[PDB]
């Protein structure tokens, strides 16, 4: 069976990037990305894409108007498509059962209903998300209940492993592609049809095939293994501070064990992002629902550590500034949850800003890719009085009592700190919540910076 | 400057094979290995070695007598030596503060004292173990307090990374060698002198050098990371069981992510070995003491999970025998904590045996390397009433309701299951605690077994 | 299909009086009550019964050795039987999981095994007790796993409601 047209509902951080790379690697196939959000779609069609992601402008501008399209016309894109990706967001329930924990599936659901409304004949529908939480099953439930003669909708699962900041390079060279489908002749034929899309650039041995459940479990689990690694090393950073060691040296040492691997062992003020917290939280919630409370409380530690590590760092900041910030100008360098993206969802920077704001600090926030309107939304009258969004970093540290580095943006390593030290109040503090200023340490002490950094007393 | 004579106190799993390997790669060096346990020394010199370890025989015979020795003469070896390794057990404390959790340094302390009563002038003294808890500090405290003129003893930390059953391979090409000594001109010369030893067979890139505390934390941490992975994958194995997934498949998909790696993702009835459990207990203890209960809490889960994995496995066996196992004959295949060793310390096999003995089961245990009189000691009326040590596996499965595979001995993969079946009571269960009978699944069903296995159904 | 020979494994407060009464009510049916407890069997065959139960002695004496028998010969009793009752005791476990709380099914399991061993062709097997705890399921498991050619064992539940 042959996929000629692809529709993707959800033009976000997953769908925009992924569809662009498929367009680029599958020039024969028409690739249409749709969304209810019109400013988003407009941006994708503009010289200024709505999200920041290395290499994305190049890939888009190479396919857009040729085999890649961004429209708000959801109905016609569904109608013509052979394959339909669902790649929408699933926010955390804000009330009811699972309040603050379970993901809300209201958008997955509205997509599947919309797909049945606008479809005839044979389509493959594929759910692609970073955190899939009973997605495929939910889609199936709706397709199974809303039949029409000769309407044959087949449901697959195709979780996205890309990390923001390296999306293009991840989509062009994935460690693996994971695809689940029913253990049925029809299921199996839909699975092949999708492998063949991926086989335009992914070699066959890197593509794994399975049922929808296993696929969602694998994704939930892997995401969780990843956040464990970071909480784990972050727990060793506290321990390092308590005993006079350096977590970067300990991490180097751990990492050389080829059974542990050396990746994802950079301690930090905390992991952020739409993925990790919500993954663990849903993994836990599910475990409880299956009456596996020991498994539930195992994973919960991944989140509890990360809440501690954030807190430790906030209060460690306040202690070094003589147990009060209740009128001082502090610089926040980096608002995004990781470097090389303007995404801030669940960002550690949001939490440090806020704690310091409960405590009376005047904050000057600089990020190179995050829009300033986004920083204002993330903090919630208090914003009026305390928060200021700066245009460059040297404007942010003018007048400042301390610089607080929250995000590992490479430009921050290359600042002229002597210029910074001059216009800073004294004694001048730098709180490096990311280890970006390793090796430069003495040099900055020489200038007279008193420097605090995670995992090092 | 230069090491020509080595003493090693402790001829156990750590001291024995590591000195054997030093001998083999460093013919210019005279290595003597010593122990209070004459019986153990005798075997080290007999044609049957006191521990089982692939390649170990050939390495010992390759240079015992020439530059490698074992004797009960502790004093003379200490006396003539440039370097003295301490490689002794540290049993868990039986009483006092931290009864049942902290390591007991009472043997390491006896070692250091005996070193001073037999030393003059220069000696490098190196702590070498799988789990080191404040070991360097408690050797140092004793050297500081037994001061003789002209006595210059330098204390180094040299954690052992080898895994039993793979010792010789690990020793001969290790992922890294970790050596910690004081950052004084004097500590540096003793560190360098230790490097110069390994430098005979290990590239300098892979030799890491630090201070002594950072050395020990590194090993505390690393061991725990390895244990976390197994507990993490075991938690997933319970989830897979409760939802129709297969943990082997989930693990393949997790492991193909290079940031996670694919090693140490084999789910199992639970880790044993003398290293992991005590390493976590100690790390927990250390964090409680240092006022880091969030971190203590964090790493404790690695153990709770392991306990629960053991318990869940037992309880499945009993369930299947419709909650009664009085006088039912059950085979236990595998008693070592892992294949290719005779070591039973903290073996999961013990723990399963204990839960089955409480149900009144008649246990028939076979293990190809564990000494019969060691199985008996581990399970201690009740033992003499319920336990038979089998000579071969087939008499262990004769009259049996269930076959429980607790150790991944490759031989188990090619037993005559047809023959075993004919002679089992029906229905006949194989509980594969190790995923060792995988893919063999269809043949076993066909034969007539009920195969339960970890992380599947 | 008609039952004409009944065997009952278990000559207790359930097995005994239930079989006596089936015998009283159905004269063309042969009813054989078996038990490992030799003493309890002889007492059933004596002028002093092993349990007191008003009106029982009259019933037993009106058909014992006529269409009601008591015997330690379990094997042949099963062999010639159309229906086999299991009417044994399930004591409370004294150790392990469910200790003090759960029933020990070991005597039910031993009846199922013995039945398979002494059986050919078609028979109906009925678990009959006052507290049936996963009894029919457990019988079925044993039977399913110990197939013979042309052995067809049917498993039923027939709980007993009498009060002593
Ligand atoms: N929303 C969250 O907070 C969230 C958090 C974690 C994980 N996830 C999951 O992981 C991935 C994250 O996705 P994302 O980062 O690209 O999120 P996103 O917010 O950046 O993009 C989602 C897009 O879906 C669009 N959309 C939603 N409902 C729609 C509908 N009914 N019809 C048409 N368009 C619709 C939204 O307008 C948005 O443009 C998703 O695939 C999701 O299932 C979501
Ligand atoms: N002792 C225990 O019960 C125990 C349990 C778990 C882990 N560990 C750890 O494992 C590592 C050592 O491993 P191993 O397998 O080689 O231990 P081992 O028990 O196999 O070997 C220890 C050897 O030390 C000898 N010994 C002890 N004290 C001595 C002394 N004062 N003088 C001379 N000889 C002495 C013993 O007789 C024994 O042969 C360390 O990290 C140790 O703390 C020990
Ligand atoms: N008998 C007890 O002590 C006991 C204790 C707890 C619960 N129960 C359970 O509650 C009810 C009591 O039944 P009952 O009062 O008539 O009990 P009972 O004990 O008076 O009778 C049981 C008879 O079955 C016999 N029996 C057991 N296993 C046998 C075997 N394998 N082969 C032949 N005979 C065997 C025993 O000897 C006993 O005589 C039972 O229906 C059962 O559900 C019994
Ligand atoms: O060693 C590390 C690694 C990562 N991090 C932090 O952990 C968080 C996650 O970073 P990632 O590199 O995983 O980026 P993402 O959140 O975009 O991707 C994650 O979720 C979606 C999945 O597809 C990706 O595979 C997974 O990596 C960030 O806050 C990052 O700064 C650390 O603090 N230390
Ligand atoms: O994937 C796995 C890996 C290991 N295990 C179990 O984990 C336990 C430990 O096994 P290892 O291979 O790590 O063997 P060891 O305990 O001998 O070595 C461990 O402690 C000594 C350290 O110096 C080693 O680096 C560490 O591996 C065994 O019970 C093994 O069966 C699993 O159940 N699944
Ligand atoms: O009103 C009452 C009734 C009964 N009881 C007591 O409750 C206990 C049970 O008495 P029963 O009349 O139920 O006699 P049994 O226990 O032999 O029969 C009971 O168990 C087996 C089931 O098959 C019967 O249906 C059930 O009645 C006796 O100790 C009796 O004295 C009371 O204390 N008050």
UniProtKB/Swiss-Prot annotation, chains A, B:
Record GO cellular component, one term: extracellular exosome
pH dependence: Optimum pH is 8.6.
Residue positions binding NAD(+): 10-15, 35, 40, 88-92, 129-131, 164, 275-278, 345
Effect upon mutating residue 41 to T: In DEE84; uncertain significance
Binding-site residues, substrate: 160-164, 219-223, 259, 266-272, 337-338, 434
Domain of life: Eukaryota
Effect caused by changing residue 441 to R: In DEE84; uncertain significance
Region (Allosteric switch region): 128-134
Positions where N6-acetyllysine occurs in the chain: 106
InterPro entries: 6-PGluconate_DH-like_C_sf (IPR008927), NAD(P)-bd_dom_sf (IPR036291), UDP-Glc/GDP-Man (IPR017476), UDP-Glc/GDP-Man_DH_C (IPR014027), UDP-Glc/GDP-Man_DH_C_sf (IPR036220), UDP-Glc/GDP-Man_DH_dimer (IPR014026), UDP-Glc/GDP-Man_DH_N (IPR001732), UDPglc_DH_euk (IPR028356)
Catalytic residues of the enzyme: 160, 219, 275
Alphabetical UniProt keywords: Acetylation, Allosteric enzyme, Carbohydrate metabolism, Disease variant, Epilepsy, NAD, Oxidoreductase, Phosphoprotein
Impact noted for substituting residue 402 to S: In DEE84; uncertain significance
Annotated control of activity: UDP-alpha-D-xylose (UDX) acts as a feedback inhibitor. It binds at the same site as the substrate, but functions as allosteric inhibitor by triggering a conformation change that disrupts the active hexameric ring structure and gives rise to an inactive, horseshoe-shaped hexamer.
Tissue-wise expression: Detected in heart, placenta, liver, pancreas, spleen, thymus, prostate, ovary, small intestine and colon. Widely expressed.
Enzyme Commission code(s) on record: 1.1.1.22
Effect on the protein of changing residue 43 to V: In DEE84; severely decreased protein stability; decreased hexamer formation; severe decrease of UDP-glucose 6-dehydrogenase activity
Family note: Belongs to the UDP-glucose/GDP-mannose dehydrogenase family.
Stated role: Catalyzes the formation of UDP-alpha-D-glucuronate, a constituent of complex glycosaminoglycans. Required for the biosynthesis of chondroitin sulfate and heparan sulfate. Required for embryonic development via its role in the biosynthesis of glycosaminoglycans. Required for proper brain and neuronal development.
Domain notes: The protein goes through several conformation states during the reaction cycle, giving rise to hysteresis. In the initial state, the ligand-free protein is in an inactive conformation (E*). Substrate binding triggers a change to the active conformation (E). UDP-xylose binding triggers the transition to a distinct, inhibited conformation. The presence of an intrinsically disordered C-terminus promotes a more dynamic protein structure and favors a conformation with high affinity for UPD-xylose. The allosteric switch region moves by about 5 Angstroms when UDP-xylose is bound, and occupies part of the UDP-glucose binding site. At the same time it promotes domain movements that disrupt the active hexameric ring structure and lead to the formation of a horseshoe-shaped, inactive hexamer.
Oligomeric and partner information: Homohexamer.
Annotated disease: Developmental and epileptic encephalopathy 84: A form of epileptic encephalopathy, a heterogeneous group of severe early-onset epilepsies characterized by refractory seizures, neurodevelopmental impairment, and poor prognosis. Development is normal prior to seizure onset, after which cognitive and motor delays become apparent. DEE84 is an autosomal recessive form characterized by onset of refractory seizures in the first months of life.
Listed name of the protein: UDP-glucose 6-dehydrogenase
Organism: Homo sapiens
């Amino acid at each position: 069976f042959e996929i000629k047209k692809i529709c993707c509902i959800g033009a976000g951080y997953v769908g925009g990037p992924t569809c662009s790379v498929i367009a680029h690697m599958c020039p024969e196939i028409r690739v249409t990305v749709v969304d209810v959000n019109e400013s988003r779609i407009n941006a994708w069609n503009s010289p200024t894409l709505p999200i920041y992601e290395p290499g994305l402008k190049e890939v888009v501008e190479s396919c857009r108007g040729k085999n890649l399209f961004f429209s708000t016309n959801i109905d016609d894109a569904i109608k013509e498509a052979d394959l339909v990706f669902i790649s929408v967001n699933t926010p955390t329930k804000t009330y009811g059962m699972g309040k603050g924990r379970a993901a809300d599936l209201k958008y997955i659901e509205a997509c599947a209903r919309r797909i049945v409304q606008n479809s005839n004949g044979y389509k493959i529908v594929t759910e692609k998300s970073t955190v899939p939480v009973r997605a495929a099953e939910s889609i199936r439930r709706i397709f199974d209940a809303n039949t029409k003669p000769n309407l044959n909708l087949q449901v697959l699962s195709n979780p996205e492993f890309l990390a923001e900041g390296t999306a293009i390079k991840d989509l062009k060279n994935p460690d693996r592609v994971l695809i689940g489908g029913d253990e049925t002749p029809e299921g199996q034929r839909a699975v092949q049809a999708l492998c063949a899309v991926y086989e335009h650039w992914v070699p066959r041995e890197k593509i794994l095939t399975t049922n929808t459940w296993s696929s969602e479990l694998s994704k939930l689990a892997a995401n969780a293994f990843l956040a464990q690694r970071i909480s784990s090393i972050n727990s060793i950073s506290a321990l390092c501070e308590a005993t006079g060691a350096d977590v970067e040296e300990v991490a180097t040492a751990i990492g050389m064990d080829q059974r542990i691997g050396n990746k994802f062992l950079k301690a930090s003020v905390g992991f952020g992002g739409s993925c990790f917290q919500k993954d663990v939280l849903n993994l836990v919630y599910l475990c409880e629902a299956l009456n596996l409370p020991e498994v539930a409380r195992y994973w919960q530690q991944v989140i509890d550590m990360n809440d501690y590590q954030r807190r430790r760092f906030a209060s460690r900041i306040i202690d070094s500034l003589f147990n009060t910030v209740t009128d001082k100008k502090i610089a926040i360098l980096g608002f995004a949850f990781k470097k090389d993206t303007g995404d801030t969802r669940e960002s550690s920077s949001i939490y440090i800003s806020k704690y310091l704001m409960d405590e009376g600090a005047h904050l000057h926030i600089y990020d190179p890719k995050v829009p300033r309107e986004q920083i204002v939304v993330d903090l919630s009258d208090q914003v009026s009085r305390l928060v200021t969004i700066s245009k460059d970093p040297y404007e942010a540290c003018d007048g400042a009592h301390a610089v607080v580095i929250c995000t590992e943006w490479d430009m921050f390593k290359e600042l002229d700190y002597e210029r910074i030290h001059k216009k800073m109040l004294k004694p001048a503090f730098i709180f490096d919540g990311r280890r970006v200023l390793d090796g430069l340490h003495n040099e900055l002490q020489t200038i007279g910076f008193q420097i605090e950094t995670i995992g090092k007393k």
